């Protein structure tokens, strides 16, 4: 069929199927099988349906795309508040309208007194945008990824306190940390990513089912210690 397109670093939706391994990972952000630990085989078919499928709700089964956890309107940030929340994310001022997991938690501006509770590892993203361009809309980038993962995302900082965004050899290699300080601030506090690979698999699963709404040329994702 299309063996010449498997792992060709270009997503081809005609080859994007579990049989063809999500176009050799090209359509699942380099994640081989986002459902590789999922105990039920046909969970991916139910991942995109906007309904709770309890048999697919385990962490191994990628929380059934949070449709058991966030069943109602709270599943998404309001689009009328989406530009405002991107503009006011991590600006050092508490904006309560953006202080929800679905809107990106205002980049933790309302929770400066809650200690960091980082997930294990670093989330590594290759974005086909130069570092300068990527950081020119970094608050928007983090806010949107925070909103998708339903947790707080920030750039990992180096010894000199600089964001770990490196040129890709064209693009960027972005290093992110996951701060679960408000994820674990209940109500259902079990729908929290314990590590960067868990988050990378979930993002791969969204890209595989074409339900990832991220306005950036995101090539791949992985978790690294």
């Amino acid at each position, epitope marked *: 069929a299309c063996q010449a397109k498997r792992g060709d670093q270009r997503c081809d939706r005609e080859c994007n199927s579990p049989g063809c391994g999500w176009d050799g990972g090209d359509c699942s952000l380099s994640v081989g099988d986002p459902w590789r630990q999922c105990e039920a085989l046909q969970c991916w078919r139910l991942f995109n349906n906007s309904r709770c499928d*309890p048999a697919c709700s385990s962490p191994a089964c990628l929380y059934d795309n949070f449709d058991c956890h966030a069943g109602g309107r709270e599943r998404t940030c309001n689009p009328v508040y989406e530009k405002y929340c991107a503009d006011h994310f991590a600006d050092g001022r508490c904006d309560q309208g953006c202080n929800t997991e679905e809107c990106g938690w205002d980049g933790l501006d309302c929770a400066s007194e809650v200690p960091a509770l980082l997930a294990r590892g670093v989330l590594v993203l290759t974005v086909l945008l130069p570092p300068e361009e990527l950081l020119r809309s970094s608050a928007d980038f983090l806010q949107r990824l925070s909103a998708i993962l339903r947790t707080s995302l920030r750039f990992r900082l180096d010894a000199h306190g600089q964001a770990m965004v490196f040129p890709y050899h064209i693009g960027s290699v972005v290093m992110l940390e996951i701060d679960n300080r408000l994820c674990l601030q209940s109500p259902e506090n*079990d*729908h929290c990513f*314990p590590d960067a690979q*868990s988050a990378a698999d979930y993002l791969g699963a969204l890209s595989a089912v074409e339900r990832l709404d991220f306005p950036y040329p995101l090539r791949d994702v992985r978790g690294e210690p």
Partner: antibody
Amino acid sequence: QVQLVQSGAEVKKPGSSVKVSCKASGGTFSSYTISWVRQAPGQGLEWMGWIKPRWGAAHYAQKFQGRVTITADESTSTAYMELSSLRSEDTAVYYCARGSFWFGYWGQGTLVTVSS
Amino acid sequence: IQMTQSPSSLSASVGDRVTITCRASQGINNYLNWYQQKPGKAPKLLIYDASKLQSGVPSRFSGSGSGTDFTLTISSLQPEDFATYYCQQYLQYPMTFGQGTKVEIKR
């Protein structure tokens, strides 16, 4: 403070059915899941399933498929576990717990005894 | 997923460092919880996600491990710590528990 209060101990004959209740107080059980876990006399713990009362979705352990019915009444902040075709092996303390994957909050446990 | 605890019974004294191990039949990453239970009482969550201490749980309780091997350590064992301890995987359905470690007083 959040508390889960269960119904009183039950005595049942084989083949009968039991319905145990669990009332949540303090928290408004709209944003949570209620789980059912049992413990036979000298034995360990066994998860039976769960319910998210906000949208009424339930999940069960395969071995309890068809015999267990988990429901909830939003207005009273109450979850129910109904177990049918009762056997002597069903004699246990049945716990109501909050959280799906891990449980911080527990009920006191309802003792059910199946004996002819 | 089969959870195996070791030992099943442990004898200790007040002040002792106590270690309880939990073996999962397959890798569960860090999706493991530890519970304490006293007779006629409901279990109590101590540790969630292998090493995270639940709020309101004394700091003398610590969890470690990843994959298939996990450890619950009680540093200066207090009188109120004599109870049964259970590990629990939360990676796949059904949620499964270890068969328990009873911690009794040495004499």
